[PDB]
């Protein structure tokens, strides 16, 4: 089949959905790869590098979309991409539908087959394609939090790890999953006092073991959450129920009680945000004021470190890309229950139950379109 | 005596040279404290907080300078402050004269007694007043380096500590002193691969012990330095001979061989900078391009975290402030050889030998004006 | 000469001032060793073990004191021992005179040569004979603090290191010296949140390095001390100016603001105690209430672990014992400036300056009785 | 339904089975909560705090028992509570029936529905309601062991972590589960030399990884066990087969070979004890001599740190409490196989197989009374 990779068009989205090695593996298996010129330049993969690997370098975005049977993107389609979505085409990318009705509508109306990176889930309930992006996001969250805590950035003017004799930043991380563990670890590495909350005690028990008590763990009860946030120089929001709109855990009213110049980073923004006052920002304009605090809500965080994130992503996605290309979406999903869990849309039907309940929209069973 | 503390006027300089507790201790010992209104507002010390402690809150900068017997600043005097410097007044602040002729000339022409925070040196050769600022600078260097390595900041687009399976940033720190140790430690905390160079093997042996080999140490030979730099995603410049103009260790020619998008942070900028292509920058305009790299050269780095740095600084300086105010500069310097080593100017005479050799200007013996 | 070691008679004092190996080394050098029967039974050194090594096992305490030229004790003489002190005898033991007038008076009236373990001081200002006892005391402080924080002991009923999800004990250690470093280290080992204060920034910088920021360090300003204490579940008092009465750093008024059931351990009790409400307690009756808190003030803490402390002590003291016995106090002190600094009393003369100022009693120069 | 929480009456039992937040969540779901006055005072939850949350504060224990449909306790019923057990009432608490026939008899004769915290078991075989109590018990075991090792407590008089130059305590932990891992970790934190034995090599492999070899691991063969114990200053007994009477692993005969003053802490005492010579003690009288050793056998260890343990417990139990209250025991157990595994007694029938074999008493299948 034809596998197409367009240039990413989201704000400051420098990643790409495939690397030369993946292009070379596709063409070894007798597949046709088409790639928009420049598509990899943000990740420092040239058109030449792609050409060498076996790719057909095309001049226009509209051509890739129209030709490609399997389409590989990093981010969700945006407004100007809605007109590109076809029928009988397989879209494989991050989707975050629970967070956007306007996007979900487009995939349904065009009737395209779509599977979502972020809902591919292995038997043990782990999400192996979101994982490395959560990894990148958690780590960015800490340094980005550190940076915006500088007075010069409008923030409070506390240094992350203090210096001997002078107290370090107080960091609160909500969620002990991949993103939250990774944020806590970097922030702790910067010398910050870190507290992680979660409703899953096992997650905290893991964190208690790994850092031998150096990262504080609190059960995410209303009482403990409120107290932590009221105290925090920096709050990082990192919760998730797989493929569901984030719950609202930090109210605007709570934010009014916070230290002036506190920074809040809502990693969960891509799935709705878990702060009441969050709204999607972009790398160009990353922050906005709420009360006396600074909010940071970039939905494509990994985008600023494409050398790292492009390879982190594609290391994980390729085995799944190969199976789609080799066997087609129906057979691939039939042979892989983890791939199947990612099925989002097919011919005007929404195949995720969770996303159907969050949007208030008709759900149809996945196993029903797999026979 | 009268002890005056003006508002800082350097770019984004949010620090102050005294805190309430210091004001309170001065007034217990029967001293008169005068403070420019707003002088502490950047460090979140109100005029009221200062009032409460025993300070006379004055409306203008020109009055403090004119009244104050002992004058306490954080940074060196700048152009618009040159007209404030008097005779028979003691100036106590960061000076960095080896790096500025125009500043040094002003102190000599005004005929003012000046001691420099950064050349106060104990018996073991440590600089206990520079120390905490080096601590803050080192730690800022790492996070600031992390931030500017993001593609969105023009940098290379590598994440500091990578993510599992994908290589972390390569960080090279030149100098194993206070700043460099602290830079290495935060950088290493962020998951970066860190290499520290120094011409003092002892310093590296300390670093090798503390992190049990996790921070790489290389003897700063021409060979090892050039190889480290050529390989680095981020170079942090942190060298010092006490009170002397920095040596030029990284040539512009070397920088041309570096990875495009590499960031270079010259902590040593305040003492001339140890990169050949360095020039003083500010928090407003922190970075300039040199070849295909990005340079960061802020001479007052600690300014962005006054909540941390103001207290770090004043924790250290007060015991010395008290001795100056209690006994006057001549007796204080006679009783404290560590205070003495800070003597810079008195009545048109330059009293530091090193600063005299770096500027090519007449040196006069300190012990000669102390009798 | 004759070297005598009495049984310790202080409350629960299970230590002894010599071990078999030390007895054996004394007798090799042609010295006569006399030891009160049972003197080592608390440290599990039998009369037989002592016999075997070369000691004359004597039946009574009064005989040892009367015969012995050099007398080796662990603790200071107590009331019933005051009648034992002779002229021309060298007493070598812990003294803590700055804290007891009635003890100091006894040494002056008896006219005895006395050197104090705890004021023997090397060139770098370290106290190598107090050191290991501070080590034992610091480590005891943490576990003893842990134990008395249990509700069943009257304390607050918080567990030292919490458990995942639930906050650990908040421990505040005042002083970053030997005792305080060791207290902080064990406490932190137990999972407690530890904060160390000190007026010597260097000491905190060492602590910040060693535990890589995991033990919090605060500069011991009035502001920071009061805030730490008000917050602490357990405060450990560990300050010292060599051989001087402890300064009073925690007032009774402050203690009234503390969490009910907080425990306070004043390691410094032996030198006066650094808590205002402290008074010497014993192992039998270790704790008294002050306000809604519980105080622990045992002046001979190491006594409860003689198997550890006896050898810790004697490991350190022997080289000094040998020099005393070999050359006599006058020649030994002339050849060792570190031994010299321990001189306390000789023939009715108080030879420590600091102890003279704390007691308000006539001081006489050490070097004057060494010629 | 009515959910009742009596005051705990066991020796020094300061915990409570519910906290305000849990009371508030129950009353939100339309349930009636009754709480014996004073029931929470040991955990510092006032009657007022409970009232505010929505609880009906009742004066007497007999009323709660009689009214409550779901009854929440921390510990097992004791002699004076046997007369309180009703029919058609759900008891939810720690039970430890394999260890007490007299208790098991009462639940059977009264015919009460009972589920046990300690046998609630998730699919992966983990016991999530015992877990946090094992956590608390392990950590207490180490400090309690440290304390009783002091000479003054009758113990051997070795300090846990020694001091430089002098050997630390030798600690042997039998069982690498939750309690044993937590004991080893605290003891290691105190500087003790720790050895953990287990018949499950994976458990030891986990411990070998976490502490990177610093905690010694030995396969719990007869040979290795004997040798460790013979050498130990402190032995902590921490084994378990879920809901079964502990195996006897340390014979009285072995104890005769041990160092005099050695302390043995049998955490497993609540399930019979794994030391041959153990017998239930209480916080009032915690220890008894066996041979030349000191045994410590408190069955309600977590009781002395109720601030920690009450919240540790209820954090875990509440989700299960809510399900019982919402749906009743039959439906709740039907929807939750982990809840179901806790079923102990119903209408005169013993529903645990393990407890039936240990007691030698008729077992009846759980699934049989769930239809
Ligand atoms: N902005 C960006 O560029 C990126 C955002 N993300 C987002 O980060 C979020 C976290 O992702 P992961 O860490 O992989 O998920 P995860 O499942 O690894 O972690 C989420 C954790 O939050 C906890 N949690 C759920 N509900 C909670 C509540 N009410 N209170 C407290 N804790 C709660 C869960 O127990 C879970 O462990 C996701 O929403 C993901 O979409 C991920 C990558 C990049
Ligand atoms: N930008 C800012 O805001 C601040 C800048 N600084 C600057 O940071 C610099 C370093 O300060 P500290 O770490 O306190 O000094 P330090 O003395 O602690 O460390 C400097 C180290 O550089 C080493 N060094 C000297 N010559 C060298 C050579 N040719 N090659 C390799 N290594 C060499 C020395 O051996 C020494 O260990 C100073 O120039 C200081 O003024 C300090 C504080 C703030
Ligand atoms: N109860 C017992 O059985 C024992 C008690 N001790 C006592 O422990 C105390 C501490 O001993 P070490 O740790 O060896 O002394 P050290 O000299 O190692 O440490 C004392 C520390 O307290 C600091 N300090 C002094 N004044 C201060 C102030 N105003 N505020 C804050 N910090 C201040 C010093 O800078 C020093 O670092 C001594 O009084 C000693 O006699 C020692 C052994 C046993
Ligand atoms: N006294 C108190 O207050 C408390 C007592 N406990 C008791 O602590 C005990 C341990 O509990 P957990 O650590 O949660 O159980 P666990 O299952 O986490 O740990 C027990 C470990 O012992 C090992 N083991 C079993 N048989 C063995 C044998 N013959 N030789 C060597 N190792 C063996 C198992 O492999 C298991 O890993 C339980 O009996 C529990 O009831 C728990 C909490 C409080």
| Reduced 3-state DSSP string for A135-189 | HHHHHHHHHHHHHHCCHHHCCCCCCCCCECEECCCEEEEECCCHHHHHHHHHHHH
- Helix boundaries (H) for A37-163: 47-53, 61-67, 101-110, 131-148
Atom 42 of ligand 2: nearest residue by CA position? B134
- What is the Cα–Cα distance from B232 to A321, expressed in whole angstroms? 34
Maximum distance among all Cα pairs of chain C, rounded to whole angstroms: 67
Measured on CA atoms in the order A358, A362, A365, A370, is the torsion positive or negative? negative
Closest ligand, as measured to the CA of D246: 4
Closest ligand, as measured to the CA of D239: 4
For chains B and C, count residue pairs whose Cβ atoms are closer than 8 Å.
16
Q: What 3-state class would DSSP assign to D306?
A: helix
Please state the length of chain D: 371
- What is the Cα–Cα distance from D243 to D357, expressed in whole angstroms? 11
The helix-helix angle for D20-28 and D306-335 (nearest 10°) equals: 30
Q: Which residues line ligand 2 (CB under 6 A)?
A: B 130, 133-134, 137, 174-180, 197-200, 203, 220, 238-241, 246-247, 249, 267-271, 298-302
Of D42, D52, D49, which Cα lies nearest the Cα of D6? D42
* Contact (Cβ atoms closer than 8 angstroms) between residue D136 and residue D117: no
The helix-helix angle for D131-148 and C131-148 (nearest 10°) equals: 140
Considering only residues 264 to 303 of chain B, which have any Cβ-Cβ distance to chain A shorter than 8 Å? 283, 303
Q: What is the DSSP letter of A301?
A: G
Task: Give the DSSP H or E segment for D349.
Answer: strand D349-350
Q: How many CB atoms lie within 10 A of CB A41?
A: 16
Q: What 3-state class would DSSP assign to A293?
A: strand
Cα of A81 vs centre of ligand 3, distance in Å, is 71
Verify whether ligand 1 is closer than 6 Å to residue A133 (CB atom): yes
Distances (CA, A) of D215 to A72, B360, D174, D220: 49, 62, 13, 15
* Contact (Cβ atoms closer than 8 angstroms) between residue A283 and residue A276: no
Please state the length of chain C: 371
Interface residue A259 vs chain C (CB under 8 A): no
- What is the Cα–Cα distance from B211 to B214, expressed in whole angstroms? 5
Q: What is the DSSP letter of A371?
A: -
DSSP 3-state percent helix, strand, coil across chain D (nearest 5): 45, 20, 40
Considering only residues 219 to 248 of chain B, which have any Cβ-Cβ distance to chain A shorter than 8 Å? none
Interface residue C165 vs chain D (CB under 8 A): yes
**Selecting from 3.30.43.10, 3.40.50.720, 3.90.1150.10, 3.90.76.10, what CATH number does the domain D1-129+306-371 have?**
3.40.50.720
Q: Which pair of tokens denotes residue D131?
A: 């877990």
CATH superfamily entry for domain B130-305? NAD(P)-binding Rossmann-like Domain (3.40.50.720)
- What is the Cα–Cα distance from C129 to C121, expressed in whole angstroms? 8
Chosen from A200, A213, A223 to mutate, greatest number of chain C CBs within 10 A: A213
- What is the Cα–Cα distance from C68 to A4, expressed in whole angstroms? 98
Nearest chain D residue to A207 by CA distance is D210
Are A143 and B139 an interchain contact pair (Cβ–Cβ within 8 Å)? no
- What is the Cα–Cα distance from B112 to A259, expressed in whole angstroms? 42
Considering only residues 333 to 352 of chain B, which have any Cβ-Cβ distance to chain C shorter than 8 Å? none
* Contact (Cβ atoms closer than 8 angstroms) between residue D129 and residue D320: yes
Are C219 and B132 an interchain contact pair (Cβ–Cβ within 8 Å)? no
What are the strands of the beta sheet with A113-116, ordered from one edge? A56-58, A32-36, A2-5, A70-72, A90-93, A113-116, A343-346, A349-350
Are B135 and A312 an interchain contact pair (Cβ–Cβ within 8 Å)? no
Q: Are strands C263-266 and D293-296 parallel, antiparallel or unpaired?
A: unpaired
Q: List, in order, residues 6 or more apart from C22 with CB less than 8 Å away.
A: C314, C318, C321
Of D147, A213, D168, which Cα lies nearest the Cα of C143? D147
Considering only residues 35 to 54 of chain A, which have any Cβ-Cβ distance to chain B shorter than 8 Å? 42-44
- Helix boundaries (H) for D213-278: 222-231, 252-255
Technique of determination? X-ray
- What is the Cα–Cα distance from B153 to B141, expressed in whole angstroms? 15
Of C219, C242, C211, which Cα lies nearest the Cα of C128? C242
Q: List, in order, residues 6 or more apart from D360 with CB less than 8 Å away.
A: none
Around C22, how many Cα atoms within 13 Å sit in the side-chain half-sphere? 27
Q: What 3-state class would DSSP assign to D320?
A: helix
Interface residue C136 vs chain D (CB under 8 A): yes
For chains A and D, count residue pairs whose Cβ atoms are closer than 8 Å.
16
Task: Give the DSSP H or E segment for B22.
Answer: helix B20-28
What's the reported resolution, in angstroms, to a tenth?
Answer: 2.8
Of C336, C360, C355, C334, which Cα lies nearest the Cα of C345? C355
Q: Calculate how close chain D gets to A231, using CA atoms only, in Å.
A: 21
Verify whether ligand 3 is closer than 6 Å to residue C297 (CB atom): no
For chains C and D, count residue pairs whose Cβ atoms are closer than 8 Å.
155
Q: Map D153-200 to HEC letters.
A: HCCCCCCCCCECCECCCEEEEECCCHHHHHHHHHHHHCCCEEEEEECC
Q: What 3-state class would DSSP assign to D286?
A: coil
Of D81, D14, D98, which Cα lies nearest the Cα of D304? D14
* Contact (Cβ atoms closer than 8 angstroms) between residue C122 and residue C303: no
* Contact (Cβ atoms closer than 8 angstroms) between residue D58 and residue D71: no
Nearest chain D residue to A223 by CA distance is D21
The DSSP bridge partners found for residue D92 are D72, D115
Of B223, B236, B161, B163, which Cα lies nearest the Cα of B195? B236
For residue B360, count CB atoms less than 10 angstroms from its CB and return exposed for 0-12, middle for 13-18, buried for 19 or more. Answer: exposed
Of D260, D184, D186, D258, which Cα lies nearest the Cα of D226? D258
Q: Which pair of tokens denotes residue A147?
A: 């940076």
Q: Which of D128, D132, D210 minimises the CB distance to A209? A: D210
Distances (CA, A) of D140 to C157, C169, D298, D308: 12, 13, 11, 11
DSSP one-letter string for C115-148? EEGGG---TTS--TTTHHHHHHHHHHHHHHHHHH
Neighboring chains of D (3 or more beta-carbon pairs < 8 A):
A, C
Verify whether ligand 1 is closer than 6 Å to residue A239 (CB atom): yes
Are C161 and A191 an interchain contact pair (Cβ–Cβ within 8 Å)? no
The helix-helix angle for A306-335 and A131-148 (nearest 10°) equals: 150
Q: What 3-state class would DSSP assign to C3?
A: strand
- Please list every residue in chain C whose beta carbon sits closer than 8 Å to the beta carbon of residue B210: 209
Considering only residues 113 to 132 of chain A, which have any Cβ-Cβ distance to chain C shorter than 8 Å? none
What separation, in Å, do the N-terminal and C-terminal C-alpha atoms of chain A show?
A: 22
Q: Are strands D170-174 and D70-72 parallel, antiparallel or unpaired?
A: unpaired
Chosen from C213, C215, C219 to mutate, greatest number of chain A CBs within 10 A: C213
Measured on CA atoms in the order A205, A207, A212, A215, is the torsion positive or negative? negative
* Contact (Cβ atoms closer than 8 angstroms) between residue A310 and residue A43: yes
- What is the Cα–Cα distance from C179 to D253, expressed in whole angstroms? 41
Q: Are strands B343-346 and B32-36 parallel, antiparallel or unpaired?
A: unpaired
- Please list every residue in chain D whose beta carbon sits closer than 8 Å to the beta carbon of residue C139: 159-161, 163, 190-191
Measured on CA atoms in the order B265, B268, B270, B275, is the torsion positive or negative? negative
Q: List, in order, residues 6 or more apart from B342 with CB less than 8 Å away.
A: B115, B116, B117, B118, B119, B120, B121, B129
Q: What is the DSSP letter of C172?
A: E
* Contact (Cβ atoms closer than 8 angstroms) between residue A337 and residue A223: no
Are B159 and A139 an interchain contact pair (Cβ–Cβ within 8 Å)? yes
Verify whether ligand 1 is closer than 6 Å to residue A359 (CB atom): no
Q: Which pair of tokens denotes residue A171?
A: 């960091």
- What is the Cα–Cα distance from D156 to B339, expressed in whole angstroms? 54
* Contact (Cβ atoms closer than 8 angstroms) between residue A74 and residue A16: yes
Interface residue A214 vs chain C (CB under 8 A): yes
- What is the Cα–Cα distance from A225 to A232, expressed in whole angstroms? 11
Q: List, in order, residues 6 or more apart from D307 with CB less than 8 Å away.
A: C156, C157, C158, C159, D43, D44
What separation, in Å, do the N-terminal and C-terminal C-alpha atoms of chain D show?
A: 22
Equal fold, C1-129+306-371 vs C130-305: yes
Are D21 and A222 an interchain contact pair (Cβ–Cβ within 8 Å)? yes
* Contact (Cβ atoms closer than 8 angstroms) between residue B68 and residue B34: yes
Q: What is the DSSP letter of A193?
A: E
Q: Would you kindly state where each structural domain of chain B is located, as residue ranges? A: 1-129+306-371, 130-305
Around D134, how many Cα atoms within 13 Å sit in the side-chain half-sphere? 26
- What is the Cα–Cα distance from A153 to A155, expressed in whole angstroms? 5
Cα of D291 vs centre of ligand 4, distance in Å, is 25
Interface residue B210 vs chain C (CB under 8 A): yes
- Please list every residue in chain C whose beta carbon sits closer than 8 Å to the beta carbon of residue A205: 164-165
- Please list every residue in chain C whose beta carbon sits closer than 8 Å to the beta carbon of residue D143: 143, 146-147, 160, 190
Neighboring chains of A (3 or more beta-carbon pairs < 8 A):
B, C, D
**Phi, psi (rounded to 5 degrees) for D172:** -120, 125
Q: List, in order, residues 6 or more apart from D183 with CB less than 8 Å away.
A: D138, D139, D141, D142, D145, D173, D236, D238, D265, D267
Measured on CA atoms in the order C273, C275, C277, C281, is the torsion positive or negative? negative
Cα of B168 vs centre of ligand 3, distance in Å, is 44
- Please list every residue in chain D whose beta carbon sits closer than 8 Å to the beta carbon of residue A202: 128
């Amino acid at each position: 089949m034809r596998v197409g990779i367009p240039t990413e068009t989201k704000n400051n989205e420098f990643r790409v959905a495939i690397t030369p090695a993946g292009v070379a593996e596709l063409t070894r298996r007798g597949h046709e790869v088409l790639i928009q010129a420049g598509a990899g330049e943000g990740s420092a993969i040239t058109d030449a590098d792609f050409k060498a690997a076996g790719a057909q370098l095309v001049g226009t975005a509209d051509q890739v979309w129209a030709d490609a049977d399997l389409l590989l993107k990093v981010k969700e389609p945006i407004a100007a991409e809605y007109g590109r979505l076809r029928h009988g085409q397989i879209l494989f990318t991050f989707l975050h539908l629970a967070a956007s009705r306007a996007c979900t509508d487009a995939l349904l109306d065009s009737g395209t087959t779509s599977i979502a990176y972020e809902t591919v889930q292995t038997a043990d309930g782990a999400l192996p394609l979101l994982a490395p992006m959560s990894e990148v996001a958690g780590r960015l969250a800490a340094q980005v939090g550190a940076y915006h805590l500088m007075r010069t950035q409008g923030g409070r003017g506390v240094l992350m790890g203090g210096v001997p004799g002078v107290e370090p930043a107080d960091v609160v991380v909500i969620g002990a999953g991949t993103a939250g563990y990774n944020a806590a670890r970097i922030a702790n590495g910067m010398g910050a006092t870190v507290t992680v909350l979660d409703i899953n005690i096992d997650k905290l028990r893991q964190l208690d073991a790994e850092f031998c008590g150096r990262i504080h763990t609190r059960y995410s009860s209303a009482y403990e959450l409120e107290g932590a946030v009221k105290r925090a120089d920096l709050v990082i929001g990192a919760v998730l129920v797989p493929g569901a709109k984030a719950p609202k855990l930090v109210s605007n009213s709570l934010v009014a009680h916070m230290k002036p110049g506190a920074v809040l980073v809502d990693i969960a923004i891509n799935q709705g945000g878990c702060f009441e006052g969050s709204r999607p920002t972009t790398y160009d304009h990353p922050t906005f004021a709420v009360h006396d605090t600074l909010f940071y809500c970039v939905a494509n965080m990994p985008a600023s470190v494409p050398k790292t994130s492009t390879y982190a992503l594609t290391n994980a996605t390729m085995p799944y890309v190969l199976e789609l290309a080799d066997h087609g979406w129906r057979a691939a999903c039939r042979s892989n229950p983890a791939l199947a869990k990612g099925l989002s849309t097919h011919e005007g039907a929404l195949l995720s139950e969770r996303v159907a309940t969050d949007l208030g929209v008709p759900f149809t069973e996945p196993a029903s379109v797999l026979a």
